Ligand binder design. Structure first.
Ligand SMILES: [Mg+2]
Length: 806
RNA sequence: UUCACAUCAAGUCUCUU
């Protein structure tokens, strides 16, 4: 339970396709490079500051220490050099003083040698693995960009010269790129990809207040209401501000309730005695400054103490601050508008980026003798054959997926459910949604249901109008009590409303009855496709089977009983908890899934109570099939490489712990797979004849497990979905454990077929259904809103065995 | 709420409030 398995083989399935990956080969010298450690005093300075200190330190001590050498820097505590520094071995203490805001002051730095980073040893590892050596290369690579650009994670960003793209609310668009050094067989790869994220516009807080509160002019003043203030506080708390009146960015902690004219602080007079002085008066006495907007609040900085309240008019927003807060429906949209391009389009943008970057002329990488190709790596992919999807009806219509898509026309559900009793709850005003609208909708709806293999028998037994989330349960109690055998409640909503949160709360936790929701606009105007996808959601919500994988066309793993698990944990931005969700198959298709859900520590990827969740799912698997899984396939979503050994140590045992809590000698083979969509590896078609759709992506089924993958471990890429817009993300899979002795072909084909079991659409999705369902559960649980919390997330006993999250 | 695609770094200081 400690070390991931080696790659078993490469696999031969599918027909070859020629691809290029945004990976650029690196030529690394066989030399040894030298590692030094740095003790900077004070040691709590951010990387940007340390970088400047070190940059000045290298220039200043030119003659004695560095000379004509060009050392790179961690930003924290590591410096690397191409040839040995004249440290010799023993520690040296250096002093730097830099320009200050007005104090002009001090930094104590010292160098000590640590080791000799062997690059030749790295070459050997790439031929059948030194993280430390890899970390050194990253530093050599991003030493320069880190100086000129704004480092964000493993990416860089700069302000447009330029476009200057707004988003409103003080937010603006910054275009950037990602750079990372990746290992692969034989070669070291430089992963490059174009990026774009939100940043706060460098403007005075006064102007910032306007964009946040939608002010034309400042005046349009009187003190901000309790409403206007809490929004501004929530938008500025945690941001850096700088003083205009007399370079020192300070970090905002809170915004005062009282205006500057009335907000006070204890000021100590020259006679020892302290007194309460207003911020407005202090700026008059001390700074000769009569406040222009005394009716506006004060930004509060430093700690809870000392106090340090600053008026809004003397503060600006520090440049280079990324926006962490999620953005409005539109801001996201216009951001995507900027990004999206298409796969051919973005491949040029990377090449354009590689052209301007010009690594082969970088002073620091020339120093280290490193060379990088200007052409994308050429890889062969295999496009796997999609599984035949089996439908029911009388004709047993088999659908064959074409380019990640199939249809339901002239086809019917595997086991369609006979809806006989159902109600309708319209929360949209009758003025917008009329009885004619509902009736039309319904008649249109039923007609689809008919040809879908899931017939709705007649008119709804109940139909009413309502308003407010408070009117949900009194109607819902009424429905369950007065209608015996009630199957479905069709709630109709006017756009966005907290009613949905209550509808899903009561329907999944309190009363426990399926509730399908639909916006007002989709009732006023109905389309056969939209209605059809609704029938996909309500059939499975009533314990139905839309379609199953073709039995004969399945991997040899289904020969014995096997459960497929899907796990994902979603996180909040406030002091809210993280939500861990784990699902599991409940049949041999696989089609039906049960959902477990927990709450845990704030920002914690490790599923804490995993052993309990897996235990529950295993019980349900036996309650549905009389079978104890001989194998456990686990698709874990959202785990990075640096956390692999962490989640493997706790979550693999947790699954094993769950197996032996049931029975002492119950040890099914466990396959632990981590799925990733959060990466920067893109695949492009070499031939223009292989491009699909004018987004021009790789076809669904494109599998890459060579050239750019892990040199020793079992990992592969699989773009299981059909790209509709922009550039597709080839989902990465990394086998952390596998008792089942899977082959490359079998596991990749299995993973690919599992992407065809997603019931919400007649498409092949990016991640397997278990992983996707797990996301839906942890997202539905977020609409479900300590121990109260655990209770809030608990699903009603009868909806406990249904795909309510569908 | 039809659906899919698309969508990880310390500003703690300088008589400073
Ligand atoms: Mg996640």
């Amino acid at each position: 339970a400690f070390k991931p398995p080696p790659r078993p083989d490469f696999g031969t399935s599918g027909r070859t396709i020629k691809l290029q990956a945004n990976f650029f080969e690196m030529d690394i010298p066989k030399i040894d490079i030298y590692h030094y450690e740095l003790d900077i005093k004070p040691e709590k300075c951010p990387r940007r500051v340390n970088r400047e200190i070190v940059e000045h330190m290298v220039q200043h001590f030119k003659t004695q220490i560095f000379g004509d050498r060009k050392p790179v820097f961690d930003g924290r505590k590591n410096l690397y050099t191409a040839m040995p520094l004249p440290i010799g071995r023993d520690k040296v203490e250096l002093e730097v003083t830099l320009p200050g805001e007005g104090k002009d002051r001090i930094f104590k730095v010292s160098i000590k040698w640590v080791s000799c980073v062997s690059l030749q040893a790295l070459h050997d590892a790439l031929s059948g693995v030194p993280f430390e050596t890899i970390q050194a290369l990253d530093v050599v690579m991003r030493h320069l960009p880190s100086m000129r650009y704004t480092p964000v994670g493993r990416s860089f960003f700069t302000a447009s010269e330029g476009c200057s793209n707004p988003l409103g609310g003080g937010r603006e668009v910054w275009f950037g790129f990602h750079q990372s050094v990746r290992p692969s067989l034989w070669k070291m790869m430089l992963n490059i990809d174009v990026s774009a994220t939100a940043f706060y516009k460098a403007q005075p807080v006064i102007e910032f207040v306007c964009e946040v509160l939608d002010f034309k002019s400042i005046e349009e003043q009187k003190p901000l209401t309790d409403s206007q203030r809490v929004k501004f506080t929530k938008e500025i708390k945690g941001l850096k501000v700088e003083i205009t009146h007399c370079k020192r960015k300070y970090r905002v902690c809170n915004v005062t309730r009282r205006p500057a004219s009335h907000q006070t602080f204890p000021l100590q007079q020259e006679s020892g005695q302290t007194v309460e002085c207003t911020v407005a008066q202090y700026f008059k006495d001390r700074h000769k400054l009569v406040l222009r907007y005394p009716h506006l609040p004060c930004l509060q900085v430093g700690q809870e103490q000392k106090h340090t309240y600053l008026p809004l008019e003397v503060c600006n927003i520090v440049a280079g601050q990324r926006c962490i807060k999620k953005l409005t429906d539109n801001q996201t949209s216009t951001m995507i508008r900027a990004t999206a391009r298409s796969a051919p389009d973005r491949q040029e943008e990377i090449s354009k980026l590689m052209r301007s970057a010009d690594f082969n002329t970088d002073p620091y990488v020339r120093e280290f003798g490193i060379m990088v190709k200007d052409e994308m790596t050429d890889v062969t992919g295999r496009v796997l054959q999609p599984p035949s999807i089996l439908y029911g009806g009388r004709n047993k219509a088999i659908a064959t997926p074409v380019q990640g898509v199939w249809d339901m026309r002239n086809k019917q559900f595997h086991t369609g459910i006979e809806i006989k009793v159902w109600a309708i709850a319209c929360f949209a005003p009758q003025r917008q949604c009329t009885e004619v609208h509902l009736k039309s909708f319904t008649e249109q709806l039923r007609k689809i249901s008919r040809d879908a293999g899931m017939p709705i028998q007649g008119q709804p037994c109940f139909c009413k109008y309502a308003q407010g989330a408070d009117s949900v349960e009194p109607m819902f109690r009424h429905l369950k009590n007065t209608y015996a055998g009630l199957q479905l409640v069709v709630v109709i909503l006017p756009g966005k409303t907290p009613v949905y949160a209550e509808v899903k709360r009561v329907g999944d936790t309190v009363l426990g009855m399926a509730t399908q929701c639909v916006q007002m606009k989709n009732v006023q105007r109905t389309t056969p496709q939209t209605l059809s996808n609704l029938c996909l959601k309500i059939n499975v919500k009533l314990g139905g089977v839309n379609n199953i994988l073709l039995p004969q066309g399945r991997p040899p793993v289904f020969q014995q009983p096997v459960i497929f698990l899907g796990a994902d944990v979603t996180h909040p931005p406030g002091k809210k908890p993280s939500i861990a969700a784990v699902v599991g198959s409940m049949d041999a298709h696989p089609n039906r899934y049960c959902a477990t859900v927990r709450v845990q520590q704030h920002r914690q990827e490790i599923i804490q109570d995993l052993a309990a969740m897996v235990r529950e799912l295993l019980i349900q698997f036996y309650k549905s099939t009389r079978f104890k899984p001989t194998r456990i396939i686990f698709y874990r979503d959202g785990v990075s490489e640096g956390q692999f050994q962490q989640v493997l140590h706790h979550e693999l045992l947790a699954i094993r712990e769950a197996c032996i809590k049931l029975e002492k000698d119950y040890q099914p083979g466990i396959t632990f797979i981590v799925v990733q969509k959060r990466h920067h590896t893109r695949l492009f078609c070499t031939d223009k004849n292989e491009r699909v759709g004018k987004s021009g992506n790789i076809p669904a089924g494109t599998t890459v497990d060579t050239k750019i993958t892990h040199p020793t471990e079992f990992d592969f890429y699989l773009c299981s979905h059909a790209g509709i817009q922009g550039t597709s993300r080839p989902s990465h899979y990394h086998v952390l454990w596998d008792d089942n002795r899977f082959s490359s072909d079998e596991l990749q084909i299995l993973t690919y077929q599992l992407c065809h079991t997603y019931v919400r659409c007649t498409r092949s999705v990016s991640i397997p259904a278990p992983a996707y369902y797990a996301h839906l559960v942890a997202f539905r649980a977020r609409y479900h809103l300590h121990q109260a919390l655990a209770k809030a997330v608990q699903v009603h006993q009868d909806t406990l065995r249904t795909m309510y999250f569908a």
